[PDB]
């Protein structure tokens, strides 16, 4: 099975890239129930340049054609306990995303779920043995509430609701 992300407008198949990292935001309010919620970044472009792991491809939420890690998933942040500072995620192995050209970009559901657990595991090293939950974006302008990027001078917008809807014990 695959995950089909609705995109507007339709991106050609040659704009398919490799997902090399993510940028997240921890939900404010300490629940103290061993439950930490993470959403896509509610930050502007200053948060993306801080990670330095994004390539030359202009992109939000997800990083396309960026730099990978070595042998292990790495998580970095300016302050871990500041929910206002975004959380940079760098993958060890990339996740390929292939756009059909009819307004949809597909992603391996098995590969995405496997990398999602390894991100939840490395987050537990920073916050303790707690339950990791991924939720959709909290809102914003179309360029940040959606996974946006450019390809040869054309702007694209893809809904990433299906990528952040998992619970990991």
């Amino acid at each position: 099975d695959t995950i089909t992300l609705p995109c507007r407008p339709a991106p050609p198949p040659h704009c398919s890239s490799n997902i090399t990292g993510l940028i997240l935001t921890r939900q404010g309010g300490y629940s103290n129930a061993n439950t930490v919620i993470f959403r896509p970044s509610g930050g502007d472009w200053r948060d993306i340049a801080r990670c330095q792991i994004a390539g030359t491809v202009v992109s939000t939420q997800l990083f396309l054609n960026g730099s990978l890690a070595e042998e292990e998933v790495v998580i970095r942040s300016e302050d871990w306990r500041d929910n206002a500072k975004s959380i940079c995620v760098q993958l060890a192995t990339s996740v390929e995303i292939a756009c059909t050209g009819a307004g949809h970009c597909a992603i391996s559901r098995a590969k995405w779920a496997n990398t999602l657990k390894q991100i939840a595991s490395k987050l537990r090293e920073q916050y303790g043995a707690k339950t990791i939950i991924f939720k959709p974006s909290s809102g914003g302008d179309p360029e940040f509430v959606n996974h946006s990027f450019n390809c040869g001078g054309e702007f694209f917008y893809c809904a990433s609701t299906q990528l952040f809807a998992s619970t990991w014990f």
Partner: antibody
Amino acid sequence: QVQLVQSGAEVRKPGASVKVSCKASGYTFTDYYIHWVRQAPGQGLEWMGWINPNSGGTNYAQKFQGWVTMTRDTSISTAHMELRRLRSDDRAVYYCARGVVHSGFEFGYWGQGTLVTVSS
Amino acid sequence: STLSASVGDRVTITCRASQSISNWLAWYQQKPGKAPKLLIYKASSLESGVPSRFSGSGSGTEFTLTISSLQPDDFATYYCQQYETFGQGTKVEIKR
């Protein structure tokens, strides 16, 4: 001169909605985060969430997730916070706060406060 | 959580919070019917426009705000803040 001016007092029927405004002046409105903190009559301060004026992103507290919506209007440098499903226990004063850091929690600039009472 | 002190007394308010690498701890002063004012950030560093009689020190999990000598303007309520969490207020009243 960085100043934040909020809307006047508001009286709302129970279960309705209230939209509070917070107009910014004296600085670049889209660079600094804007937070919202409520205060019950004799109780303490309670942080509700912040909004990113540049990207539009938000981060509400779990206690308010689903009951609060924060927006901003860049044409007038005003940040809006709407609270839905109002209850009698929501009678408090709502402050908008800006930090000294771009996205810091050290609030160095406050609005005058907006008294919001919910009564039938 | 009420403090009865006179003009010239020394006041040390202690705030129990979590330990921070950067000693993240802020103090606020609030008057009746007025918005809070930031007095100290990062446990020890003061704020411009705040008298030197205010000071703070934070080692580990104990953070304290100290007023070297109370003036008539200092009688108010004081809150400590760690990120989004605020603490209970400490009201300092005039003793007679």
